[PDB]
Amino acid sequence: IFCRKQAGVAIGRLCEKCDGKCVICDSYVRPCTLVRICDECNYGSYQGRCVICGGPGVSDAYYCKECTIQEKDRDGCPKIV
Amino acid sequence: MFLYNLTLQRATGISFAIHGNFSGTKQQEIVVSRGKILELLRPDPNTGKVHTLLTVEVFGVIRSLMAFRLTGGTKDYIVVGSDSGRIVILEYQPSKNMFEKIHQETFGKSGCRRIVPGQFLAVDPKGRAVMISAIEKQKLVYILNRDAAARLTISSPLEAHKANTLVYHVVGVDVGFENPMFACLEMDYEEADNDPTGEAAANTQQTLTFYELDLGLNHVVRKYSEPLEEHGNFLITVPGGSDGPSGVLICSENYITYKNFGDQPDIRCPIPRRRNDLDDPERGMIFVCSATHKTKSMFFFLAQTEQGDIFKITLETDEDMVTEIRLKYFDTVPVAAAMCVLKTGFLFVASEFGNHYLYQIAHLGEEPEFSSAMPLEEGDTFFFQPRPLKNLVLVDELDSLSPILFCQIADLANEDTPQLYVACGRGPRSSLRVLRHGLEVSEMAVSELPGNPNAVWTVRRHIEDEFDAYIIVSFVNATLVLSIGEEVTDSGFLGTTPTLSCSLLGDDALVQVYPDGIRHIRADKRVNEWKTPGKKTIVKCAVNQRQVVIALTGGELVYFEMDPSGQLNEYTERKEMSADVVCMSLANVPPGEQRSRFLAVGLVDNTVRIISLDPSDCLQPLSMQALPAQPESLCIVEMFLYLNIGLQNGVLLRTVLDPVTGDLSDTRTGSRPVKLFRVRMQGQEAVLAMRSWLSYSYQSRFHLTPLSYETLEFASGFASEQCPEGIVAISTNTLRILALEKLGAVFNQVAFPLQYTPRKFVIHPESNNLIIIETDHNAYTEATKAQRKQQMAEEMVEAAGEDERELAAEMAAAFLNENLPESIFGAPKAGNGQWASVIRVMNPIQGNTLDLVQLEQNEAAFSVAVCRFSNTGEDWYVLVGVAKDLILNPRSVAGGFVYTYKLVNNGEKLEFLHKTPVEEVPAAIAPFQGRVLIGVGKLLRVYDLGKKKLLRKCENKHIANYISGIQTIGHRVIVSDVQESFIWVRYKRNENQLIIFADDTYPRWVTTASLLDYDTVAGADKFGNICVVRLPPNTNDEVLWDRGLLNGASQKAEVIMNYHVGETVLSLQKTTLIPGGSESLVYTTLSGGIGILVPFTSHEDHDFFQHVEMHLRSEHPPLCGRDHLSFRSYYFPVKNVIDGDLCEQFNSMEPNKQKNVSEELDRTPPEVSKKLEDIRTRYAF
Amino acid sequence: SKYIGTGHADTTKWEWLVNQHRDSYCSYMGHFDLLNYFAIAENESKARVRFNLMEKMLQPCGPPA
């Protein structure tokens, strides 16, 4: 289940285990569009946590080229909750 | 198979225009949207003239624009709403001459979608927030602020969504430094979707709703909403804080209303109507656009009505409260997409269609001033008299081709270079415009020279002069010295002998060169002379503001340089060349230098050679180049140094200049030895080669455009009181002073006025006359307009009973004689279903009307043809297809007619022959095998001529919907359906049958069609796409149990090309635009854009531009945030087209990006630019 | 389901067409050229064409069945 609220200026992050992965489709191939998340997902204790699984977040999350081509980057906040 | 797209002429129409200091400097500029293109304009307040600073293809649909400024800032940002799902903020950068994308906030899916924001865009007047909203449901609010580094920063969006709710318009409300507020005209459709009686739909009130953004609580509250008495079409922000009483002005049918929140009463004023208006009395009146003008003391609005009339609107206040609106009629101008008031006292008027205008505001408004405070009776109205311009003075008109409705590329003028015949405009501002590639030339003076003139030169008397002081003229046996007005012998001590050159020798000095020697002339009465040593003579020469070089018999070169006192000194060294010198050139000196480095020398050797004149390496060779043939001429120039070469043959050359000369390019330029001359243009140095041609730079690119003018034989630059920047030229005896009207424009246009919107025209083959059909809906014929005016005058008298009848008769007589021009005041709007239409025969060379047939009221011409019929052999007939009493929405028609005229007196007169009735609109007429095909609604018919009527000889009933067009080759007929695209029909002679044999597999809303080959059709549609459909090989055209395939024909055409042009295309034509050039598919757009699609000749070329396009798509992404591939794939996936408008963005990029992209291509940037130019120069300038 | 415009097994003729018509008029309001086309064809001001389209948004197909 994706949050799907209005994406903000906050940037999505990935933990070490979930890195390279597109948030929407788990592909390791061609990261393309930088992930944006809703404020509530960035708020307080949630600052810098992983979009896929809530881990410490070390890298910037991306939608892959296919998700970008399909405009799946536009659906809203993709933090899995 | 594989096509490249290029724009020739960019869209000239304007959809949006905004005001600001986009440069940050105090000068005011206009950013305009041309739909597909963003453009920045500077009106010069001195000349009162508009210059394009910058144009950018944005590869998306600009749906809205705003300027905004942060509080305490000095520069305006452009915020763009678009079909991209992202709000984009741009800053213009004057230094780089580009828009720089400051922010790109994404919120939704691309396309012009109903519930995704982009249509409406509103800013807090103090810059602190922007709202972007859709037509339905979604509104988003972005907070704007600056960081510690003074860069603009943007928040996460705050939503303000409302289900089932339409938005007509949104504006920001000026509330000073209180919480930002946006006003929306909203309507809730929920009840209207739930009531089967329709009661709710009619009882639904539009509401004015005020959304407050709470900056402290970071949310948007729908603070106030109130219903409106009638629906507003748009809102105007009224100035607030200390500049006004804030609130908003709702423009509605027949009214303008002022509303504000709090204890403010509603103030309402009716829109004044024109006295004795010939329009349909049932029509209500809206304001169509507005502008706001603010000043320290006061403000006012200009609002334009549908009729073009501008009202100055002002608000009267007591304390904070508005007490009345006051309207004063201001002036009448063409109907505007946007109006903008410049602080410098000019009104820019972006016309809805046709040319745009800059007016100086001469006065700010005896004319009666109307008011909400005036008592007015139920159903009554204020009245005003329209008249000629009184507050506005026209200073500039921006020639625009929007809308292009029908174009035809042909050489009708015998100029060996076809002209584009375009039917433009709408209503009484319609025209036929002839477009010719080249610059527009104006004669500033004309004269004739005796005997055999052979050369001409121009000179100052001092370097400080604002103008030249001498023209020197040459003949085969003599020379002559003239003033810049007349022979002048004041300081002109010129020889009578034949001359090589005359020039400015130094700051106060002149020189003449002749085969014997050199004469030095001062401004003061003193003459010095030099002669050629030995038996030798001078043959060629080169000069600069402080230097002379000469070439003698046998190829000996001699050099002279000016010492500080002001005298030439001969250099000690003399050098001989390997061959005879044919020409020479020397670079102009930089203003902070005493001497110029580079001499170029051209030889019988078919080589050009570079030499230094600097004392460090004087007369030493630097570099040399071999050439295709002997030079005729040379010229070194800066914009950056270039050598230009003319050959005795018609092939020009450009090379970059340095101690080693770099890359080069060449072009046909013609047959006569190519002669090169210096010229001054827009203050810059440029060169004239001789068709004649200017070589110059604009938008960081280079252009070699001909002059649309006579054959010229020798020339020079000019500056004078009569002609401040121009040319002295000679053609045979002719001695002309010539000036160039425009820099950037690729076509010059002559405009021939028309009465109604031209639907189509055809060229009579034996005379080149154009038969034009013009047609408007909502329109009176002249006959009906006369009758309506007569009865209005009669009724005006009959309204009076007392001695007032004497005054009424005077007023009626005046009214019958008043004749306000339709092109200025608008044609009177007849009701729905009313048509006016004419058939016009005009000569294309100068647009005189040879004949004019006016059709009956409510007859609308929709098709025209010119043809012979085999039964009569030689005579030409014009067939015009007419609808009777056509109602557009909902569609209904009282049948139609085909009028037949014979065209007589060598193509000059329409003799009416007969009128043939038909059951539905004859929407297409096509000459076919000595008869004519006619598309009568869904029916395709063959008609023969007969005597009393056209005679139906064959018919097909199986076309899906209305036939929109017909084309033919041989026995094949291509039918455009209005929606079901292309159907291939074969006529069979012996059987006398029309058989459908193929169709498309997609709906296309076809607008126009061009046959490429016997099996291939190019189509345009209503949705801005081009396609090419081809019959697959071994398609057979020789053709309740039959069902066909997918409910259509048994055989299917295959789409071999798809491309979203971005603009609706109403014409396509396979043609060669330049003599000896390759053939292309020319297309015109509704926005006045002209472009080409051109086939690649080979894999290598195709592959190269494909790789260029792929790299530019990622490394130089479209400005307003739309994916380029997605945009070109708007309605169908892009197929077999490379966007050359994207490829040519390469030249606009920063050099590091050019280096990155060219490295990816295994090229260097000059090679990339060369390949871009080489394609765009083979098919069409 | 949440996206306005989506259908499902119980979508009627009327509902679907009202979607097509409201979606068409929004497309017309955005595509400046398609708006140009209609304004010229009707011999009408762009502002009035937009206003007429907005008016039509309320009940584009006549009342529900």
Ligand SMILES: [Zn+2]
């Ligand atoms: Zn994780």
Ligand SMILES: [Zn+2]
């Ligand atoms: Zn993905």
